[PDB]
């Protein structure tokens, strides 16, 4: 179950970043959404969690920095807010055929906790079946169904086991198959306590701004600026200033 | 269990809206009550919840915006308040035969929580028998029976599983058969907690202005005029100004 | 389990009101005690719950407005306050033979919760056995035995199940057989919480007045007058001013 | 299990009252202790509860108002306070042979809760052996034994079922065999909660005036003189002024 | 299980009182410790509970008022304070041989709750085996062992059952065999709550006085004098002034 | 299981007292430590509990007041504090051979609660082997082991049964074999609650005066000089002034 | 299981003290660490618990006062702080070969509660296998593993049983085999409540001083000096001033 | 299961220290990270926990003080933060081939609590395969996974057994195979309670000075400069001033 630091280093040579579509957002992430990791984005009422989701369905398809070839995406929706129509705009911003974009994204709704966990079994199996093909796993959103199946607090032990059973699979998939995984989450402080904090390597908070300007901070300070970043929402998705 | 975002797009090209009978109310809703989704209206007593329900029994039959051909409705009454006679008056406002309108609405009373969920299984299979014939599924109201078979504060574990079961079924119904589902609900904020909040993809608060005038509002604000709309109750159902 | 709104409308053509004996009381009820429904009356110490009970045993027998032929009544007593002698007066006020009146009312005492539920099985079965014959089911009073068999509050889950099991049968009987059902209830706010509030379509509160004057309000406001009504108690039962 | 209100009326024509020995006390009661009902007297220590019990042992034997022929009594003593010698003195006041009076009262001590309920089964079957011979059933006192086999505040679930069992039996006895049942009870308001309140159809509070003078009062007021009466205790039992 | 009031009266003709040795104490008891009953005496630290115990072992042997022949005594000791030597003095005060006195008293120590209950089975059986022979059953003290076997308060249900099981046997023995039973009890208000209050027909409190003077009050007032009595402790046991 | 109070008297003629070595202390006790009883001494640290224990190891051997012939002792040590060498010094004060004294004391350490109770069964049977040879049974101390195998406030149910078992055994031992039992106990008032209070028939509180001077007191006062006594600890054991 | 006080006295002739290396410490202990007993030493953060431990590994090997020949030691370490290198210094202070010292000490680490209890079985068995050979059993520290295996307070019943199971074996070993047992313990007041207080015959507290001076008090006062003692820590272990 | 303190000494002659790369930090530690022990570093975010971990991956390979030959490392990552690329930079500072260094570190990710403990069993057996080849075992971090599979305050019973199991294994590993084990841990004071405190034989707190400067401190003070040390983080790992 070990491998040498050399063999692991070989493995990390192959780590890619997928661009968010904001140069400013990307610097703050050291290139973009990092593979072999979970990146988590949260925010209240109406932050750009979901605009980021749609934007990555396109940008993950594109050759990017560092010799990233682009590839396929998987999309699990628990919010019933995925809309293929939104991608066709973002596609134009990036000058690629909408048809081909919409082909390279696999989509499933999740309706229960359990369902959501079953979908991950399938996605793991599918990544296994041939590799280097899929580059992103998006889950929008990560825990909402867990709040739903296990409300009140005599239930909490169980939610915790299940939720953790599931984020440990997420981590594994991520690392085992070299995909970036991006998840959204809501707030009550983000939900999911220690269990979710531990699973995600990068946590990003999201807040509003001068109209359509928006603010990403690496959650948990320091109050220093270069730990933050400004981007806008637009017809063509996540962009700059 | 996935499909490509292209296949999904093909499936959403068929999404429709059932006008509420208010141009103001419709605008708020991006056209009216939406397919492949649950719309929930909650409000005080005497607010349009039930008036809206009756109205939709007719407007769902009307050919409409977006290519919407009109179709049949299924109505589940937990409140003992459905009145085929209101439909006659509303049918007049829309210039349509009473008998025909009343022939196109299937109706059942639900007397218990369990009963309510057995009615869904029947509705589900009815939709499966021929696709496209039914367009709307009204439940008036969604959760009264659950408060009924489950109150006294230390009992929600059981209620909550059951409620969540039904609402995941509803979503699946909704999305799988391209129908709009529309439900009313009571207050204390709205009842149902996270479970119900999650399941409805649009939630409308209702309250009254001067007499016949009522106000509709997307729950969770914001205090922008674009998120409120004004309508009136008449002999002919939900109407304008 | 559905029927069309047309077939249901047919069914509602046959809905009757039984007069309370107060023209003023009747307006407030839109004709009287409505069939296919539960009407609930509550009030403290010594309100006219029980005078109303006796009055309906006679007025339900009489041809009334809307082509109502009159018919038979069933009377379940949990209070041990039914008194056939009282009916003989009310009979005189209405000019009909006391013998015949006393013949058209079926009477049973209930001594336990369960007993009360067994009596309803029999009454359902009896309505089934030939129809159009019975027009009223009176239960005086609705829940008193449930307070008795399930006092203290480790018992409450059970009371709730039983009580609700029973009001769901009541609703069904009502609707299935087109009878009016009238029940009395006492106060601690009426007893029975959400369970009883939901089951009864019409709730009437009762308070005292200028000697023998008495006051019915549709429970839960608005503080508007036409939601209220004045009647008197007399030798001949419920009457006006 | 029903009868017609005519059959019931025939059955109530036989209802009787056993004078208390006070014209004032009787008036309060519409003639005295009533058949087909449970009358409960509760009071402080030293109030007439027991004096009333002894008195009725004799007055139940006397031919009385309303056609009442007089008959035999069954007396159940939980208090160890019955004294055949009091009856001798009371018999003198009514001009009746001691032996005869003492021959017409059947007596048992109850030593436990369970015992008390086994005595009822015996009484029930005794009444069934010949109808009309027994007229009164006194239990002095009703619930002392239940406080005894069930105290410590977290134990009432069991007590309450048992108590309710017995009191439903009592009612059935009472109504089925046309007997008056009369019971005493203790204070802290009266003990017994809803269970006992429901079962007694008339409840009398007792308290003392100047020495030999005692006051009786229908429990639950109102503060009207017509609901209070004054009596005296003597060597000859409950008497007037 | 019933008998007639006449047959019961026969039975009560045979009720005797055993003199306490205080004329003043006796008036307050209406002749002395009454047969067919439990008489209970309590008091703190060092009241004359135990001097009364020893005195009755002698006075119960003596012909007394009302044609009482005297007879045998049973003595159950839980306090390890019975001392035959004390009786020899009291014997002298009454001029009877100490030998014969000490012969007419049966003695057993009780070391546990259960033990104490087993001793009563034997005593009942012994009274049965021939009657008219034993006149007193003394238990010193009544409940002390119950406090011991069931300390803390998760135990209380059990203590209550056992304690009540036992006082119901006591009552029965008393009544069934026409013996006086006298028991002592200590204080925390006496111990044993409703259970012991109910079982004892007569309760006497005991307090100190002008040196060796002592004060008996019928427990529970009224604050009237003739409900009290003064006696002294002496070489010869309970006496007057 | 009873005997006559004459037989009992014969049995108490043999009751003895073992001098404590203080004339003051003895007077308090009516002669010293008593047969057929448990005497309990409790006190602070450094009070004579253990000094008294050693002393009695010798004085129980001495011919004494009342005809007391002297005999053997059994000593159970839970405290690991018995010191045959103290006895040598005490033996000198009484002018008795060390070896003989040390030969007449049987000794065991108890290491657990259970162990302590198994030692009793052995002692019991030893006393039964020949009557009259052993005179004293010392347990130093009575309950330390019970606090040890049972602390944490929610565990006493089990401790208390066990403790009560042992102390009922002790009493039976005590009374059946005419031995004195003498026990020490700790403070916090004394430990042991009602259980221990009941079992000891005399309880002595101990505390110190100026240095070598200690004060003994019957627990439960009263503040009379006759209930206190003064003694001294020396090389020769408990002594006077 | 008893033996005579004479045979026990024989046994106590053979009780030895092992010198701590502080003449001042020794006086306070009446010669040193006493055999047939548990001696407990506690103290905070960094007291000389562990310097005492190492010092006894050497001084127990040396002929001392009272004809003590010296002998072998057993050392159970739960702290992972035993260091044979420290003994080689202390050996020099006492002028004995380090080799031979290190040979006469048996060492084991304990890693769990249970483990610690298993080690004692072995040590008992080893003492049995030939006697007079081992003179000390050191456990450093006594309870730390019990805090570890049973943290939180739903666990406490269990810890208590185990801990007490174990100190009762300790006491037995001590007494049965005539070894001194010395244990260390930490503080939250020392840990282990009544259970550990009872098991140890001598308890010593330890505090800091004028640099390397250190202070032993017999735990639990009196505030008198001769209940205290000053010693230093040095290259050669526990010494004086 | 014991060995002689001589055998133990032979075993400790082989104890080693792995330099941290700071002369100040090493001095604090008596040479660096120690064999046969667990050293735990805890600190805020951004403190050297992880920098130290990377550094040791290299310094454990270097021939060192005390005869330390250098050897291989096993690294268990719960944090997803190991970066073979840092080692390259650190390897440069020490003038050592990257490949060789990376070949000598065995690495595994742990994804659950259980997983983490299964990795130990594997490590244990790996050490057993050839002794002396591995020198260091790093767990980064020790307990994150235990907070993860066990939070919500009423669940620690289970967590705590498991945690304690693993840490007793660790100690045994540590001591049996002469390896240093080094672990990081998080704050809230450090997490882990008594269980973790007991298992680590040295605990270091970490916090930062001006930028690159960090401060190390033995947890549990004292506020003496000798117990603090200052180091710096660089491209070349933990360094000096």
Domains identified in chain F and CATH numbers = 1-241 (3.40.50.300)
Distance from CA of C171 to the nearest CA of B (A): 7
Contacts of E155 in chain F (CB under 8 A): 157
Among F225, F204, F179, F201, smallest CA distance to F48 is for F204
Experimental structure resolution, Å:
2.6
Residue C30 contacts B, CB cutoff 8 Å:
no
Q: How far is CA B28 from CA B202, B205, B219, B234, in A?
A: 11, 12, 12, 20
Sheet holding B37-43, edge to edge: B237-240, B228-234, B213-218, B202-208, B37-43, B180-185, B134-140, B72-77, B105-109, C3-4
**Count of all residues that appear for chain D in the document:** 241
Give the three-state DSSP class for B185: strand
- Nearest Cα neighbor of B40 from B153, B209, B190, B160 is B190
Residue among D172, H179, C195 nearest B151 (CA): C195
The token pair that represents B165 in the structure block: 């079961």
Among the partner residues C104, C111, C155, nearest to D171 by beta-carbon distance:
C111
CA-nearest of C87, C100, C46, C42 to C217 is C42
Tokens of F174: 């005590």
Give me the sign of the Cα torsion angle F141, F143, F148, F152: negative
H186 backbone dihedrals φ, ψ, rounded to 5°: -95, 175
Strands D37-43 and D202-208: parallel
Quote the CA–CA distance of D159 and D180 in Å, as a whole number: 25
Which is nearest to F11 in space by CA: F43, F28, F36? F36
DSSP string, chain H: --EEHHHHHHHHTT--EE--S-HHHHHHTTSSEEBTEEEEEEESTTSTHHHHHHHHHHHTTS--GGG----EEEEEESSS---HHHHHHHHHHHT--HHHHHHTEEEEE--SHHHHHHHHHHHHHHHHHSTTSEEEEEEETSSHHHHHHS-SSTTHHHHHHHHHHHHHHHHHHHHHTT-EEEEEE-B--BSSHHHHHHH-SEEEEEEE-STTEEEEEESS--S-GGGEEEEEEETTEEEE-
Partner F contacted by G30 (CB < 8 A): no
User: For C151-180, b where at least 16 C-beta lie within 10 A, e where not — what string?
Assistant: beeebbbebbebbbebbbbbbbbbbebbbb
Q: Is the CB of F122 less than 8 angstroms away from the CB of G1?
A: yes
**Phi/psi zone of residue A32: left (φ > 0), alpha (ψ -120 to 50 degrees), beta?**
left
> Tokens 């925010």 belong to which residue?
A43
Q: Does H80 sit within 8 Å of A175, measured CB to CB?
A: yes
Q: How many CB atoms are located within 10 Å of the residue G217 CB? A: 17
Q: How far apart are CA E54 and CA E64, in angstroms?
A: 17
Chain C and chain H touch, per 3+ beta carbon pairs within 8 A: no
Strand ranges inside A97-133, DSSP E: 105-109
CB of G155 less than 8 A from some CB of H: yes
Burial of F222 (0-12, 13-18, 19+ CB in 10 A): exposed
Q: Which residues contact G210 (CB under 8 A, 6 or more apart)?
A: none
A214 is in an annotated binding site: yes
Is residue D45 within a helix (H) or strand (E), and if so which, with residue range? none
Contact status, residue D110 vs residue D119, Cβ threshold 8 Å: yes
Strand, coil or helix: what is F63? coil
In the numeric block, which tokens belong to residue B183? Answer: 């439900």
Chain D residues in contact with E198 by the CB 8 A cut-off are 144-145, 147-148
Output the CA–CA distances (angstroms, integers) from residue D120 to D171, D179, E150, in the order listed.
Answer: 11, 13, 34
CB spacing of D164 vs C152 below 8 angstroms: no
Q: Which residues are CB-neighbours of B189 under 8 A, at least 6 positions away?
A: none
The residues that bridge with D213 in the sheet, in sequence order, are D232
Residue with tokens 């230390």: B154
| Three-class secondary structure assignment of D128-140 | HHCCCCEEEEEEE
Distances (CA, A) of F234 to F86, F105, F231, G45: 10, 21, 10, 42
CA distances from D116 to C176, D39, D152, F212, G146 (A): 45, 18, 21, 67, 56
- Asked if the Cβ–Cβ distance from B122 to C8 is below 8 Å, we say no
E1 CA: distance to closest CA in chain D (Å):
6
Neighbouring chains of B at 3+ CB pairs under 8 Å are A, C
Which three-class secondary structure state does DSSP give residue F171?
helix
Cis (ω within 30 of 0) for the bond into G43? no
Inter-chain CB pairs, B–C, below 8 Å: 75
Report residue C39: phi and psi, to 5°.
-110, 125
CB proximity A30 to B under 8 Å: no
* Residue H146 near residue H186 (C-beta atoms within 8 A): no
Chains H and A touch, contact meaning at least 3 pairs of CB atoms under 8 angstroms apart: yes
**Four-CA torsion B190, B192, B195, B201, nearest 10 degrees:** -40
User: Residue G105 is inside which H or E element, if any?
Assistant: strand G105-109
Q: Is B212 exposed, middle or buried (0-12, 13-18, 19+ CB in 10 A)?
A: exposed
> Could you tell me which residues come within 8 angstroms of residue H123 by beta carbon, excluding any fewer than 6 positions away?
H74, H76, H137, H173
- Distance CA(C85)–CA(A111), nearest Å, equals 63
G14, HSE (Cβ side, Cα atoms, 13 Å): 14
Is H150 marked as binding a ligand?
yes
CA E44 from chain center: how many Å?
Answer: 17
- For residue H110, what are the β-bridge partners? none
Q: Which chains contact C through at least 3 pairs of Cβ atoms less than 8 Å apart?
A: B, D
Helix, coil or strand: residue B42: strand
- CA-CA distance, C69 to C54, in Å (whole number)? 19
Q: Residues of C with CB below 8 A from D193's CB?
A: 151
D chain contacts of residue E171, beta-carbon cutoff 8 Å: 80, 109, 111
Q: Are E24 and E231 in contact (CB under 8 A)?
A: yes
Structure determined by: X-ray
Taking a C-beta distance cutoff of 8 angstroms, is the pair E56, E136 a contact? Answer: yes
Q: Is A87 on the interface with B (CB under 8 A)?
A: yes
Option in E2, E5, E175 nearest D84 (CB): E5
Q: How many CB atoms lie within 10 A of CB A175?
A: 18
Yes or no: say if B198 and B169 are a contact pair by the CB < 8 Å rule: no
Cβ of A2 within 8 Å of Cβ of H107? The answer is yes
Q: Which residues of G touch H1 (CB under 8 A)?
A: 108, 118-119, 122
Burial class from Cβ neighbours inside 10 Å (0-12, 13-18, 19+) for residue E18 reads: buried
CB C99 within 8 A of CB C67: no
Backbone φ and ψ for A97, nearest 5 degrees, come out as -65, 135
The DSSP element (H or E) to which A172 belongs, if any, is helix A156-177
Cis peptide before E141 (omega within 30 of 0): yes
What gap in Å lies between CA C144 and CA C159, rounded to an integer? 12
Per-residue DSSP letter, C66: G
Residue D129 backbone phi and psi in degrees, to 5: -70, -40
Chains C and D touch (3+ CB pairs under 8 A): yes
A43 is in an annotated binding site: yes
Neighbours of H155 (CB within 10 A): 15
Interface test with C, best of B78, B81, B111 (most C CBs within 10 A): B111
Question: Which residues, listed in sequence order, are joined to residue D233 by a DSSP beta bridge?
Answer: D238
Q: Which residue has the tokens 């922008």?
A: B224
> CB of E161 within 8 Å of any CB in chain D?
yes
Query: What is residue E213's three-state secondary structure?
Result: strand
Instruction: Name the DSSP class of G187.
Output: B
């Amino acid at each position: 179950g070990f491998l040498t630091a050399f063999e692991y280093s070989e493995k990390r040579k192959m780590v890619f970043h997928i661009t968010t579509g904001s140069q400013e957002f990307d610097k703050l992430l050291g290139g973009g959404i990092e593979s072999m990791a979970i990146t988590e984005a949260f925010g209240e009422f109406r932050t750009g969690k979901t605009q980021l989701s749609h934007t990555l369905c396109v940008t993950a398809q594109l050759p990017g920095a560092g010799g990233y070839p682009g590839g396929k995406i998987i999309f699990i929706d628990t919010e019933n807010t995925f809309r293929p129509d939104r991608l066709r705009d973002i596609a134009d911003r990036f000058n690629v055929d909408h048809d081909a974009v919409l082909d390279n994204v696999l989509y499933a709704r999740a309706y229960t906790s359990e369902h959501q966990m079953e979908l991950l079994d399938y996605v793991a199996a599918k990544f296994h079946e041939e590799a280097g093909i899929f580059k992103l796993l998006i889950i929008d959103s990560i825990m909402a169904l867990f709040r739903v199946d296990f409300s009140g607090r005599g239930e909490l032990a169980e939610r915790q086991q299940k939720l953790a059973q599931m984020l440990s699979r997420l981590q594994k998939i991520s690392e085992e198959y070299n995909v970036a995984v991006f998840v959204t989450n809501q707030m009550t402080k983000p939900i999911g306590g220690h269990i979710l904090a531990h699973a995600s390597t990068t946590r990003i908070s999201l807040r509003k701004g001068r109209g359509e300007l928006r603010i990403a901070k690496i959650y948990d300070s320091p109050e220093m600026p270069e730990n933050e970043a400004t981007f806008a929402i637009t017809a063509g998705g996540i962009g700059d200033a």
